[PDB]
Amino acid sequence: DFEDRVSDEEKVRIAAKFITHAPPGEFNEVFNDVRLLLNNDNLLREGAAHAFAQYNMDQFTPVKIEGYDDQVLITEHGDLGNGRFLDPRNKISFKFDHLRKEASDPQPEDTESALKQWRDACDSALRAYVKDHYPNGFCTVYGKSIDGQQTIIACIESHQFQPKNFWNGRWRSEWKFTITPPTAQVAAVLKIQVHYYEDGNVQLVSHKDIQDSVQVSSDVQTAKEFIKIIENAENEYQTAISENYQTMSDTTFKALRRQLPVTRTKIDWNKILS
């Protein structure tokens, strides 16, 4: 049954693809669709387990850990590979149920004192930046030795879910730099996704890649300069989005269909038919 195995394998690959492309705030609905369409719960819960985790890490799903005030983001940088994720702010790991989006079983996690003060300073600066620039944003900052370099990875998430009004949106941004005095390269990606689906399906998908440089000196000064780069680039991106919206409304849209013919009257269908 080689041909049948290829078909179940392809069906699960399709199901996983659909699940990972669910809009923000609509995972459950897409999952239910895919489950009923695949009609094989075993193929699904094993063959698509990776899709649940991939979606959550791709979306920077924020999660609340009981006993700690600030939420942590589920990201690829916190994946311990064993079902647990890292909270680099509270120096703990926690089990994460990707389907129920539940954090449990906090346990101390040992981290490297090398990157610790650089990470903490960037986190403190980033949290203050997010509190001021987002209505209800969350952020998580990691510090790792990666392919041979001390690296800081800052992640920001912000969503608004209003399914009763048939729309959901999410902002994600990710920022990386290596602690390489005197000057380090900054790489980042900014992402927006908005879904409106009252009597239709309209989606904004946007992303911007960033390359910049930051002066690396002390932990606290570098952290200040890093957030400055973040603020400048996120503000520029958001302003560019609005300016493009304006051009789309007042130019692009009008080159498609007119409001009325050049006659400035509705159509005389008797004249069209004679």
Binding site: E29, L36, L38, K208, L256, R257, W269
Partner: protein, 248 residues
């Protein structure tokens, strides 16, 4: 086929296509049918896709492709009434309905010119027991000289239940407009705003020399498109932008 009265998979498929990115409808629809091949005909008919343009090489005119003028892998031209590639037994309208289809195509080509001043249109009709149904297709792309690109697809399905003894008919119009805007500028990076809205109207009318089917249908399509255009402007450039700025 609509073979099942209770079909939870069909409902889930349509729900799913309201949620996956409309930028990937074509690939998603094909993968979706792989999952539920027995819904192939239902999904091809019910999931709207961006319209493709073909060239009728007999008359030298473009026409629009959709499921409604397809048979196998061949598509029927509204201008020549022939399938490309050739098909010896393709679905064809009746001789009487083809005459109406020709007039409708001429009429909506004028509608296209007046409201869109460009683009391409096509009308395809097919017979029903006590009436007929049709699709009116319009595709218009914006200026390719511009960094911000746009494209408009109209998909109007009309179902006409005729009551000739009363010289009236009942019209049901289901209209989708797919609106696509895209740019890769320095400031915003990549920005893709795309998708569709669908609305429906029904109305009874007299059918006569002074108000024939094409005039009854034209007025409905005109009213619907004028309304949808205004809703699209509000939803795309008002609502989705306000959502963005509510995120940050």
């Amino acid at each position: 086929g609509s073979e099942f009265m209770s079909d939870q998979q069909l409902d889930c498929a349509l729900d799913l296509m309201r949620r996956l990115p409309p930028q990937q409808i074509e690939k998603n629809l094909s993968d979706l049918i792989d999952l539920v091949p027995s819904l192939c005909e239902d999904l091809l008919s019910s999931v709207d896709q961006p319209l493709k343009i073909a060239r009728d090489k007999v008359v030298g005119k473009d026409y629009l492709l959709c499921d409604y003028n397809r048979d196998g892998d061949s598509y029927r031209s509204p201008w020549s009434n022939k399938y490309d590639p050739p098909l010896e037994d393709g679905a064809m309208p009746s001789a009487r309905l083809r005459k109406l289809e020709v007039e409708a195509n001429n009429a909506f080509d004028q509608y296209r010119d007046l409201y869109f001043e460009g683009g391409v249109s096509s009308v395809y009709l097919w017979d029903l027991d006590h009436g007929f149904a049709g699709v009116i297709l319009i595709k218009k792309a914006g200026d390719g000289s511009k960094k911000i690109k746009g494209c408009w697809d109209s998909i109007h399905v009309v179902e006409v239940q005729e009551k000739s003894s009363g010289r009236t008919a009942h019209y049901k119009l289901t209209s989708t407009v797919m609106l696509w805007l895209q740019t890769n500028k320095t400031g915003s990076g990549t920005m893709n705003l795309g998708g569709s809205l669908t609305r429906q109207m029904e109305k009874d009318e007299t059918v006569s020399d002074s108000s024939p089917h094409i005039a009854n249908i034209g007025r409905l399509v005109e009213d619907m498109e004028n309304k949808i255009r205004s809703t699209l402007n509000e939803i795309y450039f008002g609502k989705t932008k306000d959502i963005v700025n509510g995120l940050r």
